[PDB]
Design a binder for this molecule. Structure first.
Ligand SMILES: *[C@@H]1O[C@H](CO[C@@H]2O[C@@H](C)[C@@H](O)[C@@H](O)[C@@H]2O)[C@@H](O[C@@H]2O[C@H](CO)[C@@H](O[C@@H]3O[C@H](CO[C@H]4O[C@H](CO)[C@@H](O)[C@H](O)[C@@H]4O)[C@@H](O)[C@H](O[C@H]4O[C@H](CO)[C@@H](O)[C@H](O)[C@@H]4O)[C@@H]3O)[C@H](O)[C@H]2NC(C)=O)[C@H](O)[C@H]1NC(C)=O
Ligand SMILES: *[C@@H]1O[C@H](CO[C@@H]2O[C@@H](C)[C@@H](O)[C@@H](O)[C@@H]2O)[C@@H](O[C@@H]2O[C@H](CO)[C@@H](O)[C@H](O)[C@H]2NC(C)=O)[C@H](O)[C@H]1NC(C)=O
Ligand SMILES: *[C@@H]1O[C@H](CO)[C@@H](O[C@@H]2O[C@H](CO)[C@@H](O)[C@H](O)[C@H]2NC(C)=O)[C@H](O)[C@H]1NC(C)=O
Ligand SMILES: *[C@@H]1O[C@H](CO)[C@@H](O[C@@H]2O[C@H](CO)[C@@H](O)[C@H](O)[C@H]2NC(C)=O)[C@H](O)[C@H]1NC(C)=O
Ligand SMILES: *[C@@H]1O[C@H](CO)[C@@H](O[C@@H]2O[C@H](CO)[C@@H](O)[C@H](O)[C@H]2NC(C)=O)[C@H](O)[C@H]1NC(C)=O
Ligand SMILES: CCCCCCCCCC(N)(P(=O)(O)O)P(=O)(O)O
Ligand SMILES: [Zn+2]
Ligand SMILES: [Zn+2]
Length: 523
């Protein structure tokens, strides 16, 4: 026991964790925290110096606490004095024995799938403004001007906490020629910018109509299959389950999507889309595309306080779609915005259980939301050792934060009977702002890398990505590459030390939220 109250403990972790974000050592930061404790009379210094001694005696205990923040660490140290359970009904049909997808045979075609996510169009982006304003979003009207001649916001964007003007997005679509042709496109939400404090419903629908028409303009007859992001509504993250009716429901948003996305989605899809913002359709024989609204898994969605149990019956709906694909022989692609690893515990554990059951039917999982080049591996529930699926977390088109613009393209097993529809390889394209915003610089999108090439993989199967993680656990050079691509070729100046490495690698193995057992082989 420590004579340390709940708010008191939060002041220390604040002054420490904020300090540990760039300060070289713990000692100097430890002194600041003790001085804070003294100046404000927050607690007895013996207790304060005892807490600093524990918060990070070594980085290991804190390596587990890499996720932990003040409220999260205090609860564990103080106790209870400082989210419901539920699960899904799986059909009684016995699980087919696991068998890997057969590699494509000679002559089997390939298909290219463009993947767009996190475009975050800022209607108010303005060149020359201050990229480091006080607001959560800058490079826009109201952020001010730079101080004493410092460089303002770049023309095509900036490496800061800023989003993109329409110019950079129009430039992205126009230069897709070399990346295609595309059989279809996946678009996992987050269309508006991060100007939350001034997002009316008119603004959000303006971003939907404006970007939808733009995408449709440069893709033309190619179908685009979108998924609902967490910024698409106002207030942000607020997606009430369909049991809420009236002007406070998300119908203003869902009925606007069904109208804007009608060219791409069939009747049955729009039906569910209007109700809960999710749908399922058949884009080609043998394949079933399922678009999930991961806002109903979101931690920021305050609406789930009413009933966080499978909101909208989506997972139960997902199970039915998956089980029907299994009986039919089809394979499944799931698209969403928030990756399952970032979901609420119950929702995530149930999704993890669903993916484990239908491993032979699932051929691809695609998400975004992280804005960086990541991937989440799923393991068998019985032993948590056989990688059986992969969720590719594509990088954002926007710069938010301190990143290069970029999109993703997937090579999948082609459109033919018996195909596995699995991802065979993928590529990432970027816009190099340092060259585009420079005097005389012109937009030129280039292929950053191809996965199988840089990583030397035999394929894009779960076992290969599983083997790529532990190769990076022991190969500092192979991880730096991944770390370089992680940020779309614009890493932070802060090198990723051995605690950062294992933390990043632990994210690659944690497709289930709150499961430390998934990273037991990292130290
Ligand atoms: C956890 O910390 C608690 C707070 O710690 C303080 O806060 C930090 C920021 C620093 O300032 C640090 O130095 C402090 O210690 C701490 O709470 C303290 O606990 C002690 C005893 O456990 C309390 O002592 C008692 O105080 C009362 C009130 O004192 C004054 O008021 C009355 C009238 O209201 C007057 O009559 C008194 O003369 C005082 O002017 C006293 O009444 C009481 O004395 C009586 O009882 C004792 C024995 O019980 C007899 O010897 C006396 O003769 C009296 O009969 C105590 O002296 C202290 O008030 C309390 N302070 C605060 C701010 O809460 C706590 O002890 C720590 N907990 C643990 C588990 O360590
Ligand atoms: C909470 O909702 C669950 C989930 O069902 C959906 O929730 C609402 C949106 C509501 O409008 C229903 O029409 C939806 O179907 C309710 O039922 C649970 O359903 C899930 C599977 O989808 C299952 O895991 C649970 O065991 C079910 N529980 C029950 C009691 O049927 C449930 O009615 C709501 N529970 C609470 C406590 O609010
Ligand atoms: C959630 O948890 C368990 C899964 O192990 C389920 O317990 C079964 O409950 C159903 C009724 O819904 C019964 O048919 C089964 O007989 C129960 N268990 C066994 C071993 O028979 C539970 O039903 C699951 N489902 C839900 C909706 O929570
Ligand atoms: C429906 O709900 C909206 C949600 O905000 C109500 O609020 C108005 O609309 C915008 C967003 O669309 C808000 O930013 C404003 O605060 C509100 N309007 C104004 C002029 O400030 C809206 O009033 C509701 N609509 C109806 C018709 O009742
Ligand atoms: C984007 O373009 C910039 C500018 O051409 C590249 O930055 C250079 O990187 C080399 C690497 O050794 C440095 O020596 C130069 O000083 C950098 N130039 C500037 C102006 O900073 C950058 O490498 C390019 N990024 C990608 C992903 O292609
Ligand atoms: C250099 C690595 C850091 C990248 C920055 C990531 C920002 C994340 C944005 C959000 N997840 P999204 O909902 O906009 O996707 P948010 O929830 O923070 O808004
Ligand atoms: Zn985003
Ligand atoms: Zn998002």
């Amino acid at each position: 026991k420590l004579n340390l109250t709940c708010p008191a403990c939060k002041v220390l972790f604040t002054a420490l964790n904020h300090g540990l974000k760039k300060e070289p050592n713990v000692a100097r930061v430890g002194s600041v925290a003790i001085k804070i404790c003294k100046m404000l009379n927050i607690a007895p210094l013996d207790v304060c110096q005892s807490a600093v001694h524990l918060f990070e005696d070594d980085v290991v205990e804190v390596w587990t606490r890499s996720v932990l923040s003040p409220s999260e660490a205090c609860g564990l140290l103080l106790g209870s004095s400082c989210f419901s359970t539920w699960n899904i009904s799986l059909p009684s049909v016995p699980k087919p024995p696991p068998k890997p997808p057969s590699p494509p045979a000679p002559g089997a075609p390939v298909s290219r799938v463009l993947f767009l996510t996190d475009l975050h169009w800022d209607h108010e982006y303005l060149e020359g403004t201050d990229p480091y304003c006080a607001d959560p979003l800058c490079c826009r009207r109201g952020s001010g001007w730079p101080p004493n001649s410092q460089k303002g916001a770049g023309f095509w964007g900036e490496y800061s906490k800023c989003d993109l003007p329409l110019r950079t997005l129009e430039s992205l679509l126009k230069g897709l020629g070399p990346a295609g042709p595309f059989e279809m496109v996946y678009w996992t939400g987050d269309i508006p910018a991060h100007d939350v404090w001034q997002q009316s419903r008119q603004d959000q629908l303006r971003a939907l109509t404006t970007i939808t028409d733009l995408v449709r303009k440069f893709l033309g007859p190619v179908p685009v299959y979108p998924a609902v992001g967490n910024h698409e509504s106002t207030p942000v993250n607020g997606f009430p389950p369909p049991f809420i009716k009236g002007n406070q429901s998300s119908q203003w948003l869902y009925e606007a999507m069904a109208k804007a996305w009608e060219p791409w989605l069939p009747a049955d899809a729009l039906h569910t889309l209007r109700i809960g913002g999710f749908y399922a359709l058949t884009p080609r024989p043998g394949l079933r595309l399922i678009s999930l609204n991961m806002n109903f898994c979101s931690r920021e969605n305050f609406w789930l306080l009413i009933n966080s149990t499978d909101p909208a019956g989506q997972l139960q709906w997902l199970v039915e779609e998956l089980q029907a694909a299994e009986n039919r022989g089809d394979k499944v692609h799931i698209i969403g915005h928030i990756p399952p690893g970032h979901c609420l515990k119950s929702w995530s554990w149930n999704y993890y259980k669903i993916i484990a059951r239908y491993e032979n039917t699932l051929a691809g999982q695609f998400f975004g939301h992280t804005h960086v080049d990541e991937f989440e591996i799923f393991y068998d529930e019985e032993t948590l050792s056989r990688p059986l699926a992969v969720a590719f977390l594509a990088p954002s088109a926007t710069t938010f934060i301190n990143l290069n613009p970029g999109y993703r393209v997937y090579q999948i097993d082609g459109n033919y009977p018996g195909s596995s529809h699995v991802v065979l390889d993928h590529e990432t394209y970027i816009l190099n702002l340092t060259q585009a915003n420079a005097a005389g610089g012109t937009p030129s999108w280039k292929r950053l890398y191809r996965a199988r090439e840089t990583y030397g993989l035999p394929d894009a199967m779960p076992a290969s990505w599983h083997n790529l993680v532990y190769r990076m656990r022991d190969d500092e050079q192979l991880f730096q590459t991944f770390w370089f691509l992680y940020h779309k070729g614009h890493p932070p100046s802060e090198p990723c030390g051995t605690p950062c490495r294992l933390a990043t690698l632990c994210a690659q193995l944690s497709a289930r939220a709150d499961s430390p057992a998934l990273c037991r082989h990292l130290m």
